[PDB]
Design an enzyme around this catalytic site. Sequence first.
Site, PDB file in Angstrom:
ATOM      1  N   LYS A 278       2.310 -25.607  14.507  1.00  0.00           N
ATOM      2  CA  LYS A 278       2.863 -25.661  15.840  1.00  0.00           C
ATOM      3  C   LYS A 278       2.591 -24.343  16.570  1.00  0.00           C
ATOM      4  CE  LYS A 278       7.010 -27.058  18.279  1.00  0.00           C
ATOM      5  NZ  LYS A 278       8.079 -28.055  18.017  1.00  0.00           N
TER       6      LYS A 278
ATOM      7  N   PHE B  91       4.303 -27.441  27.062  1.00  0.00           N
ATOM      8  CA  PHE B  91       4.665 -26.080  26.579  1.00  0.00           C
ATOM      9  C   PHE B  91       3.985 -25.676  25.254  1.00  0.00           C
ATOM     10  CE2 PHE B  91       8.811 -26.819  23.857  1.00  0.00           C
ATOM     11  CZ  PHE B  91       8.556 -28.177  23.674  1.00  0.00           C
TER      12      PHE B  91
ATOM     13  N   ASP C  76      16.853 -33.719  20.909  1.00  0.00           N
ATOM     14  CA  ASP C  76      15.490 -34.336  20.954  1.00  0.00           C
ATOM     15  C   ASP C  76      15.241 -35.424  19.842  1.00  0.00           C
ATOM     16  OD1 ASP C  76      13.000 -34.713  22.179  1.00  0.00           O
ATOM     17  OD2 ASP C  76      11.941 -33.162  21.083  1.00  0.00           O
TER      18      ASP C  76
ATOM     19  N   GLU D 295       1.644 -33.139  21.212  1.00  0.00           N
ATOM     20  CA  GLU D 295       1.860 -32.079  22.211  1.00  0.00           C
ATOM     21  C   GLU D 295       2.939 -32.393  23.264  1.00  0.00           C
ATOM     22  OE1 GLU D 295      -2.290 -32.102  23.504  1.00  0.00           O
ATOM     23  OE2 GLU D 295      -1.659 -32.445  25.594  1.00  0.00           O
TER      24      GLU D 295
HETATM   25  C1  LIG Z   1       5.692 -31.554  11.522  1.00  0.00           C
HETATM   26  C2  LIG Z   1       4.783 -32.571  10.885  1.00  0.00           C
HETATM   27  N1  LIG Z   1       4.535 -32.544   9.576  1.00  0.00           N
HETATM   28  N2  LIG Z   1       3.668 -33.559   9.224  1.00  0.00           N
HETATM   29  C3  LIG Z   1       3.375 -34.256  10.285  1.00  0.00           C
HETATM   30  N3  LIG Z   1       2.574 -35.377  10.463  1.00  0.00           N
HETATM   31  C4  LIG Z   1       2.430 -35.931  11.686  1.00  0.00           C
HETATM   32  O1  LIG Z   1       1.714 -36.910  11.814  1.00  0.00           O
HETATM   33  C5  LIG Z   1       3.071 -35.403  12.835  1.00  0.00           C
HETATM   34  C6  LIG Z   1       3.881 -34.293  12.774  1.00  0.00           C
HETATM   35  C7  LIG Z   1       4.541 -33.733  14.027  1.00  0.00           C
HETATM   36  C8  LIG Z   1       5.754 -34.560  14.470  1.00  0.00           C
HETATM   37  C9  LIG Z   1       6.459 -33.866  15.630  1.00  0.00           C
HETATM   38  C10 LIG Z   1       5.505 -33.658  16.820  1.00  0.00           C
HETATM   39  N4  LIG Z   1       6.167 -32.808  17.826  1.00  0.00           N
HETATM   40  C11 LIG Z   1       5.770 -32.742  19.123  1.00  0.00           C
HETATM   41  O2  LIG Z   1       4.827 -33.387  19.554  1.00  0.00           O
HETATM   42  C12 LIG Z   1       6.522 -31.799  20.020  1.00  0.00           C
HETATM   43  C13 LIG Z   1       6.253 -31.723  21.527  1.00  0.00           C
HETATM   44  C14 LIG Z   1       5.688 -30.653  20.598  1.00  0.00           C
HETATM   45  F1  LIG Z   1       6.217 -29.360  20.627  1.00  0.00           F
HETATM   46  F2  LIG Z   1       4.351 -30.701  20.327  1.00  0.00           F
HETATM   47  C15 LIG Z   1       4.275 -32.902  16.367  1.00  0.00           C
HETATM   48  C16 LIG Z   1       3.555 -33.581  15.203  1.00  0.00           C
HETATM   49  C17 LIG Z   1       4.078 -33.644  11.439  1.00  0.00           C
END
Ligand SMILES: Cc1[nH]nc2[nH]c(=O)cc([C@H]3CC[C@H](NC(=O)[C@@H]4CC4(F)F)CC3)c12
Length: 288
Positions: free
Chosen positions: A45, A23, A138, A20
């Site tokens: 998300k 936002f 980012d 997280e």
């Molecule tokens: C997209 C995804 N596919 N598979 C996953 N496996 C994972 O362990 C973790 C993630 C995401 C990695 C990017 C993180 N991005 C944020 O926290 C941004 C602030 C926000 F907008 F939350 C979220 C988790 C995974």
Amino acid sequence: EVDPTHFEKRFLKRIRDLGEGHFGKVELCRYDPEGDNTGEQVAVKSLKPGGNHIADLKKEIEILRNLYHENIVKYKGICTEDGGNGIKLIMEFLPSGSLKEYLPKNKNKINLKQQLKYAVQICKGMDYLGSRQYVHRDLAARNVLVESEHQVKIGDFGLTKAIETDKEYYTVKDDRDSPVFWYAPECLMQSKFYIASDVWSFGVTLHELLTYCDSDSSPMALFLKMIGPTHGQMTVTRLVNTLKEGKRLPCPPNCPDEVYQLMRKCWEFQPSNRTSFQNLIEGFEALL
Ligand SMILES: Cc1[nH]nc2[nH]c(=O)cc([C@H]3CC[C@H](NC(=O)[C@@H]4CC4(F)F)CC3)c12
């Protein structure tokens, strides 16, 4: 006949949190229409309870929908609100997770050769993005996912922005919760974001990767050792002044000098006198 990029809210069941921000957040959900715990796992998300933020998620969705690359995480679909206005982004779940979580646990399996391969793979996803007229803003080890031990992917596009054809950068307004220790000096000073600024951030990401995302030697904790732990509001201006002097993050332990010079090239002060992602691939490939 049914649209497969359309996920109904009722069947979307939460399992755990993955990340997280200030936002939005990303959860682990099973999309389970059959109702028997057999359905596919996905990254969902969504926004926290924001008029200006629904705009940003829609943009992010439409950017991620149209990126097709081995080293970028895959858009699966959307889940809409029943009224209209609210919305969720559905992505593939990669269970080994971000490099931040992965590297501390799998240091034995992952060596210098493998770290440089990840590095190439991050530069290829990033050059595809760039060539599509986008600036990421980012790029951190926390947004690089592990598909397998031989494959990483850029997994978050929250701050990603189009550069116009006429201009050679993007000017941000809402800089409030930015990742400052990952940022080039033009980002810190003029609020400006060039493709060359993503290269700056790569150099820092590459630093994290080479230190196995050890918190004690992270960009924040090493920058905060250099400038001063406790400056509050003055942190960012004091950061800008050490970078002006020529102070950069030190060589990670067990990183050879030749790798460190590719890293150093990412961190030249002016955006125009800074290496490109293509040049970095060729430098990494030559070492491998
Ligand atoms: C997209 C995804 N596919 N598979 C996953 N496996 C994972 O362990 C973790 C993630 C995401 C990695 C990017 C993180 N991005 C944020 O926290 C941004 C602030 C926000 F907008 F939350 C979220 C988790 C995974």
